[PDB]
From a paper:
Here, we report two genetically related human mAbs, 12-16 and 12-19, which blocked receptor binding and neutralized all SARS-CoV-2 variants or subvariants tested, with in vitro potency similar to some of the authorized antibodies. Interestingly, these mAbs did not target RBD but instead targeted a quaternary epitope formed by NTD and SD1. Antibody binding to this site locked the RBD in the “down” position, uncovering a mechanism for receptor interference and virus neutralization. To determine molecular interactions of 12-16 and 12-19 with spike protein, we employed cryoelectron microscopy (cryo-EM) to visualize Fab fragments of each antibody in complex with S2P-prefusion-stabilized SARS-CoV-2 WA1 spike protein.
Surprisingly, rather than recognizing RBD, 12-16 and 12-19 showed similar recognition of a quaternary epitope on the spike situated at the juncture between SD1 and NTD on the side of the spike. Despite their similarity, the 12-16 and 12-19 Fabs approach the spike protein at somewhat different angles, resulting in differences in their recognition. Antibody 12-16 binds higher on spike, with its light chain making more contact with NTD, specifically from contacts of CDR loops 1 and 2 with the NTD N4 loop. The CDR L1 loop forms aliphatic contacts around K182, which reaches toward the CDR L2 loop and forms a salt bridge with D51. The antibody light chains contact NTD around the N4 loop, an interaction modeled for 12-16, but not for 12-19. Antibodies 12-16 and 12-19 share conserved heavy-chain interactions, including a salt bridge between D53 in the CDRH2 loop and R577 in SD1, as well as hydrogen bonds between N73 in the FR3 region and backbone carbonyls in SD1 loop 2. For 12-16, nearly all (96%) of the spike particles were classified into 3 Fabs bound per spike, whereas for 12-19, most (65%) of the particles were also 3-Fab bound, with the remainder classified into a 2-Fab bound class. Thus, the antibody and its CDRH3 forms a “wedge” between SD1 and NTD that prevents the conformational rearrangement necessary for RBD to reach the up conformation. However, the reason 12-16 exhibited neutralization plateaus for certain SARS-CoV-2 variants, whereas 12-19 achieved complete neutralization for all tested viruses, remains elusive.
Author numbering:
A (entry chain L): 1 to 9, 11 to 95, 95A, 95B, 96 to 107
B (entry chain A): 736 to 826, 854 to 1029
C (entry chain C): 981 to 1078
D (entry chain B): 981 to 1029
E (entry chain B): 736 to 784
F (entry chain C): 295 to 443, 447 to 624, 641 to 676, 689 to 735
G (entry chain A): 27 to 69, 80 to 143, 159 to 250, 264 to 392
H (entry chain H): 1 to 52, 52A, 53 to 82, 82A, 82B, 82C, 83 to 100, 100A, ...
The structure:
Amino acid sequence: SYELTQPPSVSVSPGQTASITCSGDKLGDKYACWYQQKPGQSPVLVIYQDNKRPSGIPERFSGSNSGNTATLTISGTQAMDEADYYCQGWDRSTGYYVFGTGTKVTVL
Amino acid sequence: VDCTMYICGDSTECSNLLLQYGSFCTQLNRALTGIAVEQDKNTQEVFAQVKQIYKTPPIKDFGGFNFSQILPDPSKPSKRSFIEDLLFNKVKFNGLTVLPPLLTDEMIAQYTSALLAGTITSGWTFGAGAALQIPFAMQMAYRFNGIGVTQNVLYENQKLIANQFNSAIGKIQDSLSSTASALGKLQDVVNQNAQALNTLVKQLSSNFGAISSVLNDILSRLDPPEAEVQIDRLITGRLQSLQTYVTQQLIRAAEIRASANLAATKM
Amino acid sequence: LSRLDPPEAEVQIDRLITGRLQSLQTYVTQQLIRAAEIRASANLAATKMSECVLGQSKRVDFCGKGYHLMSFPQSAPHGVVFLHVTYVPAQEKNFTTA
Amino acid sequence: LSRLDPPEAEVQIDRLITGRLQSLQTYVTQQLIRAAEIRASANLAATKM
Amino acid sequence: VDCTMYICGDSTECSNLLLQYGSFCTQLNRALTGIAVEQDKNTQEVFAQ
Amino acid sequence: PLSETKCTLKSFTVEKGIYQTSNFRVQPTESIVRFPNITNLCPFGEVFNATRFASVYAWNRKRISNCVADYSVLYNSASFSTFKCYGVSPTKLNDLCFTNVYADSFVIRGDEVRQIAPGQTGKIADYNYKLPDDFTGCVIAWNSNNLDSGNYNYLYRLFRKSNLKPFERDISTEIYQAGSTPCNGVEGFNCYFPLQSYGFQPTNGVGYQPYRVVVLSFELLHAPATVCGPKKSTNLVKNKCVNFNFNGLTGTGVLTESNKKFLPFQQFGRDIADTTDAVRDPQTLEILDITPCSFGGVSVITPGTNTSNQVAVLYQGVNCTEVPVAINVFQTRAGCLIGAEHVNNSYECDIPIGAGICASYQTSQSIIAYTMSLGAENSVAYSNNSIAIPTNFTISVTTEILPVSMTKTS
Amino acid sequence: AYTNSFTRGVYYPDKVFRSSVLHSTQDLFLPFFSNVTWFHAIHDNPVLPFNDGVYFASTEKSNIIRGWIFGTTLDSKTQSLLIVNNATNVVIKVCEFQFCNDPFLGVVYSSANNCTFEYVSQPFLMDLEGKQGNFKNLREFVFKNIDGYFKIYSKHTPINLVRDLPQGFSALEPLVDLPIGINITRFQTLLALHRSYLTAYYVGYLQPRTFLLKYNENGTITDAVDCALDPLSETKCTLKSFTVEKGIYQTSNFRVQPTESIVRFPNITNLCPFGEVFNATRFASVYAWNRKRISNCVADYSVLYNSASFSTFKCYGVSPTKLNDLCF
Amino acid sequence: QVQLVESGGGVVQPGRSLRLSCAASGFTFSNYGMHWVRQAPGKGLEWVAIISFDGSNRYYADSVKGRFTISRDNSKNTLYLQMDSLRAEDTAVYYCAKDLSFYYDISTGYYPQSYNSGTDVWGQGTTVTVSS
Ligand SMILES: *[C@@H]1O[C@H](CO)[C@@H](O)[C@H](O)[C@H]1NC(C)=O
Ligand SMILES: *[C@@H]1O[C@H](CO)[C@@H](O)[C@H](O)[C@H]1NC(C)=O
Ligand SMILES: *[C@@H]1O[C@H](CO)[C@@H](O)[C@H](O)[C@H]1NC(C)=O
Ligand SMILES: *[C@@H]1O[C@H](CO)[C@@H](O)[C@H](O)[C@H]1NC(C)=O
Ligand SMILES: *[C@@H]1O[C@H](CO)[C@@H](O)[C@H](O)[C@H]1NC(C)=O
Ligand SMILES: *[C@@H]1O[C@H](CO)[C@@H](O)[C@H](O)[C@H]1NC(C)=O
Ligand SMILES: *[C@@H]1O[C@H](CO)[C@@H](O)[C@H](O)[C@H]1NC(C)=O
Ligand SMILES: *[C@@H]1O[C@H](CO)[C@@H](O)[C@H](O)[C@H]1NC(C)=O
Ligand SMILES: *[C@@H]1O[C@H](CO)[C@@H](O)[C@H](O)[C@H]1NC(C)=O
Ligand SMILES: *[C@@H]1O[C@H](CO)[C@@H](O)[C@H](O)[C@H]1NC(C)=O
Ligand SMILES: *[C@@H]1O[C@H](CO)[C@@H](O)[C@H](O)[C@H]1NC(C)=O
Ligand SMILES: *[C@@H]1O[C@H](CO)[C@@H](O)[C@H](O)[C@H]1NC(C)=O
Ligand SMILES: *[C@@H]1O[C@H](CO)[C@@H](O)[C@H](O)[C@H]1NC(C)=O
Ligand SMILES: *[C@@H]1O[C@H](CO)[C@@H](O)[C@H](O)[C@H]1NC(C)=O
Ligand SMILES: *[C@@H]1O[C@H](CO)[C@@H](O)[C@H](O)[C@H]1NC(C)=O
């Protein structure tokens, strides 16, 4: 079994940094990607290769991966960042693409 | 080997050019068919020497001589004995076609079983006429007479001779079951046939000076009058290759026939 | 030759010599193989004459099926025929032996 | 090779290749048949020995 | 007999042209090697008894 | 089949036996074409009607890829006075898919365009534009007097220190030392500048007025074929013998789903014999095994026409399920024996089929097929104290026949 | 420095799938156990030759190698090829580059002078070492320039061996097959430098070699024999097998080769009167064609051939160019 | 525009079968490996299956291995997911996602052999529900 553990939710004040963490027993050996999902809409890729933003995503998104944890972070959270963020352990050679439990970031 | 399909299959354009060369393909097919029938004749003359299929008796009191390693094993699907089982274990390409032998391995094993049973239960009498039964001790005594040794040399020490024969048979069993490659004479025939076929099929890829070694490329690229000068080149090359194969196979079949005649004489 | 002049007659002639020369090499090659086959049978016929006719053969099934007595040679076109007189036993009778 | 350039030299070379290849093939075929004869003679000599 | 040497020895143009004919040289050399080994087999069979 | 046997032997009476009369082969049911789904036509117009052609010494070079290249329109056009190809038929270009189709353009003095061909020798061929002796492609040329003529801007090279290699270009302009003495800086004794203009005045007669030349060079089946001809792809059929065309690779056989794991860069497969036996479909990119659809010899089992005209036909090594595609049934190991009834009784061999099966004429009277009997079964009464001694004898004269000689042909 | 390339530099020679067969391919391969120069570019990058091909290998810890420069002059006087992999896109480009004396990538390098090729696409060089931790990727490349194509092969494998290439086998697979057509004779690597001072990897050279490639049942090359490495390999190559039984096998033919060429011509000096032939005031009527024997000459036919005065010059049994070397 | 659109959603009984179809346009479908991803109502994402650029290699999640079967038809630019023996847990909106990184460029033969991990483009989604 593989259970990429994330906290159910993280609360953040608007304009304050939010550290969204994803954990896995061997996630350091694997690449991690993050997908943003507003309710009623399909996921949108925000981070891949553990630190790389695809074209068009705001520069304030960032991530890191080391050891058993991969962590996405936003330098400044706006009102539109309230969404569900899912981590994914990516490894083409092993055919391993399991998603994470997800995390609803709460803006209040 | 089908000469027409080997030189060029699925092409009337090449086949019409091949008919210009005459009856070369008929001659090669005739030679290969002659070789094929010759192989069946070779097997028949060697093994099919007994008129009747003799059976060893259910009780095998042969004076102490144990032939269990050579008599047939009824516990397996085939008639093969144990040593025969050891021996049999130790040993669609653009026109090619491997015909099956007339006598299956089961039938050849049955022939050898008939020969063994006749020899054991009747000595040499079954080769001269009707199988005259004789106890194996007396048969071996009169076979000692044939080498200038009196009969009593067997009877006075029959047990020693029986034990020596059994030990020798067991040693043959061990030698055949070991890592030794004693059957190189048959493996050489198999390897030579396989190598000849491999060379024939691998000379289909040579272009012999043509623009390409594949006729579908020549026909799909060139109009007839320019395709004919390339297809003729391929026809010449492949016909020479097939002629070489058939000639060497004729020589190989000649030596195999000499070996088969020797084997029949030995039998 | 009567249709074409030498400058391109030779091109057509050369296709016939290669073909006829090849068609003649095949004939000689197969006759050489057949001559060896007949030579092997002539050596056997000469051995049968020496051993079956000129003497009595103890070799089994060489000079006929059975116990050889004598053979008689008869000529035939491109071959020889041997009439192998042979002694085959008959009328067996079982007997107790020691 | 010294008289003709490769475009036309290869045409002349092919004729020599074919002729010498046929000569060599004929030689080996005769040698194979003669070796069969000598092998028969050697088997006879071994039997006589 | 070396096929490449006999046909067109010491000429790379013909050595390249001869590859178009395939493995004829391999077959011819294999045949004479077989004949050559057979001669030693014959002598050993006749004399070494 | 009996008449086919008689024609094969070229005789009206055929003795008892089994004769191979012809060869059976399954015939293709339909045709298949599978070209890559190239999404655009080809810019031949930009080459053939170009405002300015290049000089022969500086011949242009256009690399053509990702094309639906219709060569028929070029050939049907009446402008091209010269349109000849040296490794392909001009009318058969539109059904072959090629790679890196290179289109070179330049202007030639006139009738010397004939030097643009493999193996040609001359000023143009040796020193200006050389193409290989094994050239595959097409040379296209047409008169352009009303486009390039006076005019002096088209030049050509008189001299070069060695013959140009195939598809070689020279842009150097150093002075050629024709004589056996040094020359530097200027055209001295036996020393010339290697280039000069054609001089395409309109007054030039036929064979000297300018000729525009376009030569296309092709490579095929060396890579993912890109400059594919216009032929439309058809559907894909599997498990039925069919003649196909994958990117120009023509053939015949039965296509089947393949378990072969082609790497991404591999487009074809080959057997130990180096014969093509798998192909990646250019449309769906799936691997299809190509197996040659069933073939085999046909053998006619006949008694003597003296006895009966009834015959049986054996399709050697062919399965019964697909023989009627070409034209009693009994599946022998050697193939399907049609016309002979199988009988469980085992008799001695009369006509050997193979693999232990023999056929014979028996009786209400027909051709039978059976497993041959090796001989009468005999349980010899062996016992350790019983001997059988003959009480009488028989003198048997068995004739033996041996060839001795053959005819002395010469 | 120098190090041993045990069995590296082998690649898939063609786009044909083969399984369970030993195929004897003849192509530019790196010879087995060849000496590959080991460069410590960081304590520089020399411009190295490109003889027939180049086997390029590296085991860098943080992906400092970002691409290569190929060409002959590398000074904008001739077309040159550039491969440089930026963080998000490789740019394969052939222009008349005005390369700097010390090329490197900032943390940026390009040109557009009379340019004739560009292919911007996904990058094949990325920072993969961080995932492997201590184990270091061994990036291998093979470059070739034949038949107008610039062919690139590649293979990246995890290793821990430090000072030398692995004692193992892995066949390189193609990256690109670029229709390029330029003349390549020199090349150099370009590096990613954080400090832009506008003032590590192994290199081996391919040679024409016949290789016996073993394809396993899955179709991958698992082992190979360099037929010219040693007599044992040649025996394995001749038999088309990787294991040979006891015996004596004829593998090739030895031939002493000539040391030098010798020419011995007669001591004749007088030049030959072709001028009297071609510059005659009056040519004969065709029904009375002239017949002038030419003997005891040193005849130079090149001036006749290259002279533009002749509208037709065709020789049937001899080649016009080879007349000078021939003695008649 | 690079877009993906799914189809074939609906209501299904347990033990029956259904097939989804994701149509691709605006990009070379044959170059990119494709994913199927499902999201149960009110739950997080779950990876369903992946298919190689040519269909040679396919992987499935343990919750669907042996029941589902992923396939593609590059000549139609369509992606298929055959579902057999549907159960209650299979109630989820199914997405088809394009790889950010293509495995092999058939147009030019470019074979990077090293790929980014992202899946940039996702489909709109089609609902599937399983109940009796
Ligand atoms: C001897 O004969 C008996 C009875 O057939 C058999 O069980 C035993 O295995 C034989 N031993 C040998 C020497 O094979
Ligand atoms: C000898 O015994 C056998 C036992 O089967 C019997 O068939 C035969 O008639 C007896 N006599 C002869 C003729 O040998
Ligand atoms: C050039 O234009 C003329 C117009 O008549 C036409 O014959 C020819 O096809 C054109 N060349 C092209 C487009 O290849
Ligand atoms: C042909 O058949 C007839 C009638 O059965 C018979 O008398 C004759 O001998 C046969 N001839 C041959 C050639 O066997
Ligand atoms: C012939 O093909 C049929 C197809 O149903 C198959 O069942 C049978 O085994 C085949 N027979 C042989 C001898 O291969
Ligand atoms: C032969 O025997 C088999 C098995 O007993 C039977 O199925 C078959 O019908 C028999 N054939 C004939 C022709 O009697
Ligand atoms: C021996 O056999 C012959 C027939 O071959 C017969 O005429 C004779 O009467 C027999 N004699 C005895 C002793 O039975
Ligand atoms: C070349 O390789 C051989 C064998 O590894 C070695 O002995 C020799 O020192 C090397 N020479 C160079 C130039 O490093
Ligand atoms: C990589 O090069 C391409 C070439 O156009 C450029 O568009 C892109 O922005 C570059 N990426 C980076 C990381 O600068
Ligand atoms: C291209 O080359 C020409 C000749 O050397 C030169 O004049 C021109 O400046 C170069 N390219 C450009 C547009 O700078
Ligand atoms: C390539 O360039 C080098 C250096 O200028 C030169 O020596 C060589 O002859 C050139 N080769 C070709 C194919 O032009
Ligand atoms: C070949 O592929 C099969 C199926 O994926 C696999 O089981 C096998 O291990 C592979 N072969 C090797 C040598 O790994
Ligand atoms: C020819 O002979 C002269 C002497 O008469 C000698 O000086 C000269 O070197 C010779 N020429 C050659 C070709 O060596
Ligand atoms: C005729 O004279 C010219 C010089 O005016 C010279 O080049 C030429 O070689 C002479 N004749 C021949 C041999 O053509
Ligand atoms: C090729 O692509 C078109 C869309 O451009 C598509 O409709 C068609 O199904 C594809 N296949 C064929 C064989 O045309």
